[PDB]
């Protein structure tokens, strides 16, 4: 119906979920013989974990040992991602300048690819941060069931576009649509309970 003029043409051309869901590349380390593909997966892992290339934020590559083990294929991409998480660079750029709730947000963005699911997950990961630091936090969230059901042992994590539960997709959208160090506010501070127990 109607004449369908150019302003609303440009509106409805990008209408629903943005095309970045399909216009990406999933980095699966298929074989370690292709050293070029190994290097591509390693740089993609750097970009996924630290939201950008880590060239202006190193003296030299401190993960070169992890690159060597990954190229020799006695560690997997899951262990490479865990080694990136349990590193001084990740805590310098994502744990030192942020409160622990923001650390939960940025950690699940970089590692699980999506926003925190619920207040139960927030409480669990906050308890792990309060008790054992961030290394056990990264280890738990990487060795959890969801990481292996989505990515597995050979796939670099990517930005995910979930449907369930509620607010997970918009909080993921607002967590990924802002670029690095854009603001210090909390996209998902906590989920307000509809019923207060006691």
């Amino acid at each position: 119906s109607a004449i369908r003029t150019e302003p609303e043409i440009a509106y409805r051309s990008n209408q629903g979920v943005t095309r970045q869901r399909q216009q990406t590349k999933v980095f699966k380390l298929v074989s370690t013989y292709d050293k070029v593909a190994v290097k591509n997966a390693i740089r993609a892992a750097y970009r996924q974990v630290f939201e950008r290339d880590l060239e202006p934020y190193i003296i030299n590559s401190e993960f070169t040992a992890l690159e060597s083990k990954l190229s020799n294929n006695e560690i997997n991409v899951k262990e490479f991602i865990e080694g990136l998480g349990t590193s001084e660079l990740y805590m310098k750029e994502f744990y030192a300048p942020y409160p622990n709730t923001k650390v939960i947000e940025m950690g699940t963005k970089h590692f699980l690819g999506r926003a925190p699911l619920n207040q139960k997950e927030i409480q669990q990961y906050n308890q792990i941060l309060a008790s054992q630091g961030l290394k056990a936090f990264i280890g738990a969230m990487v060795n959890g069931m969801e990481y292996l059901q989505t990515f597995g042992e050979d796939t670099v994590p990517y930005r995910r576009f979930p449907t369930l539960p509620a607010a997970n997709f918009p909080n993921t959208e607002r967590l990924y649509n802002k670029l690095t160090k854009q603001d210090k506010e909390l996209v998902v501070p906590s989920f307000t309970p509809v019923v207060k127990v006691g």
Partner: protein, 67 residues
């Protein structure tokens, strides 16, 4: 840090994945000690068979200096 090396065979029981899957089906990986119990629980929940496991790093029965 006294890590393990394991070989495990993890099949897929719910999906027929059409790309290459030996690199996450039959693999040899270095697993740290404090992560190894959780990793083994994860593999046995996912249905994998631990073919081989050994302490390739460190000395067994150490009391102190395990870091």
């Amino acid at each position: 840090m006294r890590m393990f090396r394991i070989t495990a065979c993890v099949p897929s029981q719910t999906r027929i994945r059409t790309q290459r899957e030996l690199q996450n089906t039959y693999f040899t990986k270095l697993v740290p000690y404090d992560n190894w119990f959780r990793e083994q629980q994860r593999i046995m929940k996912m249905g994998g068979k631990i073919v081989k496991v050994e302490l390739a790093t460190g000395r067994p029965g150490t009391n102190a200096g395990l870091a």
